[PDB]
């Protein structure tokens, strides 16, 4: 059940230690990114913020107030600001982020705001007992895209890398590694075929069925452009 916290950020319940949110945002377009919200032991992980620390602010705030869990960790996807647009208040608020090298340095040469620690290959962070693990399985939507698999409840945010099952466009391939892509969709469906939840980056979230869909427009996109 969508549950509107803000006239433009809603939260959704995929489990009783995980939720996904949608952030509204105008820009292109008033487009939706989504994220996730970790919860265990009263302690919160942020997976990606909405596009800016207004939102960002507001989603923390209702995870603190109704959730009633504090934000003490963040993960981006990727460089992009539908991933990191909210990190500078984080930082603020006190939050330990990590994030793949290749974003902290992406973020760090754009002068915007740096995840501090940074992992190269996988990293799995207890969320005060919970593990959320981190992998950079290859380039796709982005060269420093990774995923975060979440071991206990099955769920995978394979972020922006992965289309809903309505998409059809490839979408924004300006930082993206158009012929990586269909390698790492395969790496991330071989390496968590337990998927029951699949979110991606825009739009609604199902099941494995996510990758081979995302995969399919890849490839058509590779072939259009004969
Ligand atoms: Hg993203
Ligand atoms: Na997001
Ligand atoms: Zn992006």
Not at 89 to 118: C, F, R, W
Request: charged residues 20%.
């Amino acid at each position: 059940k969508s549950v509107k916290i803000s006239d433009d950020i809603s939260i959704t319940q995929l489990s009783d230690k995980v939720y996904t949110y949608v952030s509204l945002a105008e820009i292109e377009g008033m487009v939706p990114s989504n994220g996730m919200i970790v919860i265990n032991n009263h302690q919160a992980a942020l997976l990606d913020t909405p596009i800016n620390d207004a939102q960002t602010e507001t989603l923390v705030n209702w995870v603190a107030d109704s959730l009633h869990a504090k934000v003490t960790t963040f993960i981006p996807n990727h460089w992009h600001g539908d991933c990191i647009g909210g990190l500078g208040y984080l930082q603020k608020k006190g939050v330990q982020s990590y994030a793949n090298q290749m974003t902290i340095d992406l973020a760090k040469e754009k002068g915007l705001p740096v995840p501090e620690h940074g992992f190269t290959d996988s990293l799995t962070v207890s969320l005060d007992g919970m593990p959320l693990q981190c992998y950079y399985l290859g380039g796709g939507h982005a060269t420093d895209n990774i995923v975060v698999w979440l071991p206990t409840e099955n769920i995978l945010f394979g972020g922006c890398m992965l289309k809903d099952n309505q998409a059809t466009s490839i979408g924004n391939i300006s930082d993206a590694d158009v012929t990586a892509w269909p390698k790492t969709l395969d790496k991330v469906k071989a390496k968590f075929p337990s998927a029951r939840y699949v979110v991606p980056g825009h739009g609604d979230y199902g099941g494995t069925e996510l990758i081979e869909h995302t995969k399919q427009i890849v490839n058509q996109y590779i072939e259009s452009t004969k």
